[PDB]
């Protein structure tokens, strides 16, 4: 059994910064540090930090007066940011710079009273944060998930309209939604392509190359990691069996029985120790040395705030 490893895979620059932010806050100020929502969608990363006395909560009401609160890498609405400001809390913001960039565009559209369409998945905290940058009742902020949603959307002024995207979407699907928006709303204004970030594009491109060679693809990532799910979905649509797994214990022998080539990748929030343990388990079920595929180089790093050292 040949084991192939996708490249790039695993931590992106926003995740690495968000994890550092919490760790350094814990090191500067001690336990407890409160965090609103899982800092990133990875059970191991979360369990890690939690067992080291970060405390994860879903609402600012659960955080005590005088405490330190960190916002997750997915970002938060204006209302959440205001609710923390109107409380007694010291706040550090771990929102990824690439999410903040999309926030700034929505806020701009809002000030101008111009209507905005976000492409994204309803209920995801990034979508809640991003939609929550829009406050002008003169305009409007609308969410679409698919070409069908576009086909049924009506807006107040289609001459003054822009669109933005969630950063972790399927490159291919989003492209279909943009083609629909442009046909429905010829004057809509957006980015040249989308707001999908470099790490999301790169992991999709890497898993496409992997799935070309591998019969089965295992994607290391938690169930609620949107970007991890896109990697698995991509492989599946190429007709490969693909499984989203949190760790090596999830691997079922039947998945890899009589398989000549198995590929492994990891979502943007999954630590490399998890991939190492998965490779050790596949070697137990008969695979040889893991071979890394050649891939696009990534060179971007986002530093913690100078306050966090
Ligand atoms: O579920 P998502 O893909 O947004 O998040 P995850 O926490 O796994 O990865 C890092 C967050 C990406 C924000 O863009
Ligand atoms: S997936 Fe992209 S936008 Fe999201 S944290 Fe990573 S680098 Fe930032």
Any idea how long the chain is? Answer: 309
3.20.20.450, 3.30.70.120, 3.40.1010.20, 3.40.50.720: CATH of 1-11+197-298: 3.40.1010.20
What residue has token string 């596949």?
A: 282
Q: Which CATH architecture has domain 12-96+299-309?
A: 3-Layer(aba) Sandwich (3.40)
Q: Could you identify the atom of ligand 2 that is nearest to the CA of residue 227?
A: 1
Output the residue whose Cα is nearest ligand 2's atom 8. Answer: 14
DSSP classification of residue 132: T
- 158 within 8 A of 111, measured Cβ to Cβ: no
* Known binding positions: 12, 41, 74, 96, 124, 167, 197, 225-227, 269
Return the ∠ at Cα 45 (arms to 93 and 19), rounded to 5°. Answer: 30
Q: Which of 126, 212, 215, 307 is catalytic?
A: 126
Which of 58, 41, 167, 172 shows the shortest CA–CA distance to 103?
A: 167
What residue has token string 């609405």?
A: 77
Where along the chain do its domains lie? Answer: 1-11+197-298, 12-96+299-309, 97-196
DSSP classification of residue 189: B
- The finding on whether 231 has its CB within 6 A of some atom of ligand 2 is no
Q: Could you identify the atom of ligand 2 that is nearest to the CA of residue 12?
A: 6
- What residues does 265 pair with on adjacent strands? 219
CA-CA-CA-CA dihedral for 51, 54, 55, 56, to nearest 10: -100
Residue 269 CB contacts under 8 Å (≥ 6 apart), including other chains = 11, 15, 40, 41, 42, 45, 221, 222, 225, 227, 228
3-state secondary structure of 270: coil
3-state secondary structure of 35: strand
3-state secondary structure of 163: strand
Q: 286 C-alpha to center of ligand 1: Å?
A: 33
- 282 within 8 A of 237, measured Cβ to Cβ: no
Residue 298 is among the residues annotated as catalytic for this protein: no
Cis-peptide into 88, omega within 30 deg: no
Burial class (CB in 10 A: 0-12, 13-18, 19+), 156: exposed
Residue 239 CB contacts under 8 Å (≥ 6 apart), including other chains = none
Cis-peptide into 110, omega within 30 deg: no
Q: Under CATH, to which class is 97-196 assigned?
A: alpha beta
Which of 165, 226, 174, 218 shows the shortest CA–CA distance to 195?
A: 165
Pure H helices in the chain:
13-29, 43-51, 78-85, 97-111, 125-131, 147-152, 171-184, 198-213, 226-237, 253-256, 272-284
- The H or E element containing residue 219 is strand 216-220
274: its two tokens: 């998890």
**Cα–chain-centroid distance for residue 258?**
34
CA distance 308 to 95: 15
CA distance 171 to 196: 7
CA distance 220 to 214: 16
Domain 1-11+197-298 matches domain 12-96+299-309 at the CATH topology level: no
Give the ligand with the smallest distance to the CA of 200: 2
Residue 20 CB contacts under 8 Å (≥ 6 apart), including other chains = 304, 308
3-state secondary structure of 177: helix
Q: Determined by which method? A: X-ray
Burial class (CB in 10 A: 0-12, 13-18, 19+), 254: exposed
Residue 162 CB contacts under 8 Å (≥ 6 apart), including other chains = 105, 109, 114, 115, 116, 117, 188, 189, 190
- 302 within 8 A of 97, measured Cβ to Cβ: yes
CA distance 107 to 63: 27
Give the ligand with the smallest distance to the CA of 202: 2
CA-CA-CA-CA dihedral for 180, 181, 186, 189, to nearest 10: -140
- 39 within 8 A of 54, measured Cβ to Cβ: yes
Long-range Cβ pairs for the range 81-85 (8 Å, 24+): 84/60
The angle, 0 to 180 degrees and rounded to 10, between the axes of the packed helices 13-29 and 43-51 is 10
């Amino acid at each position: 059994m040949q084991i192939l490893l996708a490249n790039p895979r695993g931590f992106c620059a926003g995740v690495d910064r968000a994890i550092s932010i919490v760790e350094n806050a814990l090191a500067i100020y001690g336990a407890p540090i409160y965090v609103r929502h899982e800092v990133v969608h990875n059970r191991y990363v979360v369990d890690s930090l939690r067992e080291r006395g970060a405390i994860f909560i879903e609402q600012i009401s659960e955080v005590p007066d005088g405490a330190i609160l960190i916002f997750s890498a997915h970002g938060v609405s204006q209302a959440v940011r205001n609710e923390a400001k109107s409380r007694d809390l010291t706040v550090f913001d771990a929102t990824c710079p690439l999410v903040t960039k999309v926030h700034m565009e929505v806020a701009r559209a809002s000030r101008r009273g111009e209507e905005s369409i976000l492409i994204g998945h309803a209920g995801h905290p990034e979508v809640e944060g991003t939609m929550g940058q829009y406050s002008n009742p003169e305009g409007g902020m609308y969410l679409v998930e698919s070409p069908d949603d576009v086909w049924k959307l009506t807006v107040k002024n289609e001459e003054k309209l822009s669109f933005m995207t969630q950063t972790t979407l399927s490159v291919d699907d989003t492209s279909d939604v943009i083609d629909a928006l442009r046909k429905r709303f010829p004057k809509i204004v957006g980015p040249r392509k989308d707001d999908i970030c470099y790490a999301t594009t790169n992991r999709q491109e890497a898993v496409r190359a992997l799935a070309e060679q591998a019969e089965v693809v295992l994607v290391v990532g938690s169930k609620n990691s949107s970007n991890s799910n896109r990697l698995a979905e991509l492989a599946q649509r190429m007709g490969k069996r693909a499984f989203l797994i949190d760790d090596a214990k999830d691997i079922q022998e039947e998945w890899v029985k009589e398989v000549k080539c198995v590929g492994v990748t990891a979502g943007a929030s999954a630590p490399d120790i998890l991939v190492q343990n998965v490779v050790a388990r596949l070697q137990q079920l008969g695979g040889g040395e893991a071979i890394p595929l050649e891939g696009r180089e990534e060179n971007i790093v986002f530093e913690v705030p100078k306050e966090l050292r």
